[PDB]
């Protein structure tokens, strides 16, 4: 469910400006569910997913190499 969470998180960030999400004050922010730890968890898991997709793109240039070989033939 990482792609659907990343896409609706992208929609959330593109909808609301940074000052609102930084000055977000909700009464249920205590301990492990406060805003710092929530944004830290989201950020670090997004870092892992981004590293995976970067390795996938770099490995995905193989198809351009194969099409270049078939263009040579």
């Amino acid at each position: 469910t990482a792609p659907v969470a990343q896409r609706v998180l992208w929609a959330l960030f593109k909808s609301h400006p940074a000052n609102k999400l930084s000055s977000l004050s909700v009464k249920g922010a205590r301990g492990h569910k406060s805003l710092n730890e929530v944004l830290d968890a989201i950020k670090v898991y997004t870092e892992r997913h981004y590293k995976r997709i970067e390795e996938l793109v770099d490995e995905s240039y193989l198809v351009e190499y194969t099409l270049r070989e078939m263009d040579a033939l």
Partner: protein, 785 residues
């Protein structure tokens, strides 16, 4: 080793199970048989009784547009369809888990909705004999069904559910009672309104009218309240006039009229009945100006009341072919032609050969009955302490004697010579009545539960409350011996024809066999799951089997035992209540058994898997592209006609099907399966990878199997030709998908960095002092070495 079989069964009009139907016939439910009476003359028309089934019947429904076909719902969960022309079951439906409780028919009668106590409602087709579908809502049991197509139901979780039928999911729900239970449902015949009867005596009233928006169909137009605050059993509407009848399980039926909702509905009349009514039903007779309300009581009777529309009169009643409360004793004649049955409130004596009642008396309570020889007079010992005497041939009461003061005569036995009777009571004494004049009494330690004589009138045997048996001599009442070893008090006893055996039935769920010389227990044999009420020997050893005996218990069973070889020879089922009394014939060829049932009875490859799924998807793609060309030419009717596996899996796309068959396999098996896949199967896989990357889903899985395909076939791809076209398509689609996903996650991580820095700037510090020592996650990470 002759066994026993059910041959006769009688003494019953409508049971305490629900749902009476009228047709001028009344169709009611006896225990396992559905029987139809005339109300005018008391002779029943017919009985519907099936040899394959034993379970009790508890829901009846008449099909509309075709009477002489009926739907009955039993206790095991089965439904049968009967005919009134011929008494057979044409179709049987075994769909539910337990206890069908509410039936309903369509207006056209082709469709049948049955709701159970196992909370499933299942709708049934009647031309294909297939369970159509299974509607699934309802926290607990469904108490009301109706066909509005549409279905309207209500359950014991106090919810009315309005279901659709074209799309088998619920359209509406509403909650009828806030903290109670909706107990009954009544629909107007024109579908304008529905009233639901709840636990407090409150009747809620709803109006009906005749998906992406707010659908609103049922509207709580108001609440009503009846007079009695009981759990309301039914609400029945008049099919023709403007009335309905509301009743709970009580002695009143409240008929209200249709003209705030309290102004719309006013009580027309309140009908008192003599017994607690279980199910009311409506009847309209051709040529009368009245309301024939047909009530069927729990106390074993039908009553037809006439209600005048714009008072009640007890017009018709059926009470002669049944005892009205509960049979406590049976005693059958010396000529074995007639028997007597003694119930609370009544004596009714019957003929065996015709199974039809002949005489009726009224007594207060009837513990023990036995007739005197010559079968002219009968003896009844009652709960109030007395002994009444009646006679058959003139049908009258001769004598009454206060045997004990207020202590119930628990045992009555006639002498085998026939000149004396013995009554053992709930007092300590047991009295002897010679004919009647009191001859000798016997004072003993506790209350005498059961006493019996010997067939050669030599020794007597009382059976106390002290869990013991005292066997005395008959001439002088000296203690011959006493039998012990019963954990709970003895309920009954029967001793053998030659007086060499006693069986002794206790409340500790076993029977004992004593030898009656020295009184040694032959074998204590635990044979019933509940406290064994009664035992009886067959008296004649003319047939070579005089040491056999029957035992009837609270677990709805009779058992035929052999005392010589100490072995149960038969188990007699067929009773649906705690069997109170039984008796055997003097010839011994049949026996009668009278229950709590109120029915007395008479007994005589992974790679190959993904490859075939690839081929299925490929044929689906070709059919869909041909259908696209057809619908582009003209909007005419063109069916794609895909695979039954796809239209059974639910019209999923071929992409979704082949994605699931690639997702199901574990990753090592995925590596081996894609290795085993041949190059004839590769191009279809490459088209489906193009489809995945186009409609992006599982991009890491798509790229994984794509790079495995290219690396394990790199020379063959660069030598072939059509792979250029489809690989160019998959390159464009995969690069677009990867760039889109990567740019979205990059925007996310950049925004999270920005908002984290802003939150740090909010968090930093307010005060400034000399101590900046005020301005980190830590994990534990144990390790053994």
């Amino acid at each position: 080793y002759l066994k026993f079989e059910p041959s006769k069964s009688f003494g019953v009009v409508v049971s305490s199970n629900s749902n009476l139907v009228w047709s001028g016939q009344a169709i009611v439910a006896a225990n396992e048989e559905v029987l139809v009476w005339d109300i005018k003359k008391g002779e029943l028309l017919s009985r519907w009784r099936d040899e394959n089934c034993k379970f009790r019947v508890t829901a009846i429904a008449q099909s509309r547009t075709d009477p002489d076909v009926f739907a009955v719902g039993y206790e095991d969960g089965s439904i049968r369809l009967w005919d009134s022309k011929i008494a057979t079951s044409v179709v049987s439906f075994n769909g539910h888990k337990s206890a069908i409780t509410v039936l309903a028919f369509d207006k056209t009668g082709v469709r049948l909705a049955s709701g159970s106590k196992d909370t499933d409602i299942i709708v049934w087709d009647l031309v294909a004999e297939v369970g159509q579908y299974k509607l699934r809502g309802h926290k607990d049991q469904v108490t009301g069904l109706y066909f509005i197509g549409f279905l309207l139901t209500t359950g014991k979780d106090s919810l009315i559910k309005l279901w659709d039928l074209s799309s088998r999911h619920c359209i509406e729900t509403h909650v009828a009672q806030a903290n109670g239970e909706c107990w009954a449902l009544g629909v107007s015949p024109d579908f304008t309104g529905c009233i639901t009867a709840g636990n407090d005596g409150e009747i809620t009233v709803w109006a009906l009218d005749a998906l992406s928006q707010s659908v609103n169909f049922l509207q709580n137009r108001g609440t009503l309240h009846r007079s009695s605050k009981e759990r309301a059993a039914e609400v029945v509407f008049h099919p023709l006039r403007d009335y309905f009848a509301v009743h709970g399980v009580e002695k009143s039926v409240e008929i209200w009229r249709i003209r705030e909702v309290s102004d719309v509905f006013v009580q027309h009349v309140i009908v008192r009945t003599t017994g607690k009514v279980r199910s009311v039903d409506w009847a309209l007779n051709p040529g009368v100006k009245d309301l024939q309300l047909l009530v069927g009581g729990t106390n074993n009777l039908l009553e037809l009341y006439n209600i005048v529309g714009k008072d009640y009169n007890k017009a018709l009643a059926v009470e002669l072919p049944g005892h009205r409360t509960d049979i406590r004793s049976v005693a059958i004649s010396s000529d074995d032609k007639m028997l007597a049955s003694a119930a609370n409130g009544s004596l009714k004596i019957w003929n065996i050969k015709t199974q039809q009642c002949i005489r009726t008396f009224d007594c207060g309570y009837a513990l023990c009955c036995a007739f005197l020889p010559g079968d002219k007079v009968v003896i009844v010992g009652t709960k109030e302490g007395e002994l009444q005497l009646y006679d058959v041939a003139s049908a009258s009461l001769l004598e009454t004697v206060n045997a004990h003061d207020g202590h119930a005569v628990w045992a009555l036995q006639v002498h085998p010579d026939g000149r004396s009777v013995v009554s053992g009571g709930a007092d300590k004494t047991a009295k002897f009545w010679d004919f009647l004049v009191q001859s000798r009494i016997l004072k003993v330690s506790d209350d005498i539960l059961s006493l019996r004589f010997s067939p050669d009138a030599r020794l007597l045997a009382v059976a106390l409350l002290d869990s013991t048996v005292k066997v005395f001599f008959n001439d002088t009442l000296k203690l011959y011996l006493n039998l012990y070893g019963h954990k709970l008090p003895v309920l009954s006893m029967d001793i053998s024809y030659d007086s060499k055996l006693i069986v002794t039935s206790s409340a500790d769920k076993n029977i004992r066999i004593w030898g009656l010389d020295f009184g040694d227990c032959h074998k204590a044999l635990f044979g019933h799951q509940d406290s064994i009420l009664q035992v009886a020997f067959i008296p004649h050893n003319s047939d070579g089997n005089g040491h056999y005996f029957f035992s009837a218990s609270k677990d709805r069973t009779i058992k035929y035992w052999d005392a010589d070889k100490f072995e149960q020879i038969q188990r007699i089922d067929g009773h649906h209540g705690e069997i109170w009394a039984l008796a055997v014939s003097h010839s011994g060829r049949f026996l009668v058994s009278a229950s709590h049932d109120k029915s007395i009875r008479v007994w005589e490859m992974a790679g190959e898997r993904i490859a075939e799924a690839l081929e299925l998807g490929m044929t689906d793609l070709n059919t869909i592209r041909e259908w696209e060309e057809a619908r582009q030419i003209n909007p005419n009717i063109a069916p794609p006609q895909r695979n039954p596996i796809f239209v059974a899996l639910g019209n999923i796309p071929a992409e979704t099907y082949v994605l699931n068959t690639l997702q199901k396999i574990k990753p090592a098996s995925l590596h081996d399966a894609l290795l085993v896949l041949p190059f004839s199967t590769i191009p279809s896989l490459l088209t489906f990878l193009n489809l995945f990357a186009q409609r992006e889903l599982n991009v890491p899985l798509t790229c994984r199997i794509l790079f495995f395909v290219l690396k394990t076939h790199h020379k063959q791809i660069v030598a072939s030709r059509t792979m250029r076209a489809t690989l160019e398509k998959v390159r464009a689609n995969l690069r677009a998908a990867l760039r889109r996903q990567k740019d979205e996650m990059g925007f996310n991580i950049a925004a999270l960095k920005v908002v984290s820095m802003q939150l740090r700037d909010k968090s930093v510090r307010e005060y400034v002092d000399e101590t900046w020592e005020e301005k980190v996650r830590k994990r534990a990470f144990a390790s053994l070495s």
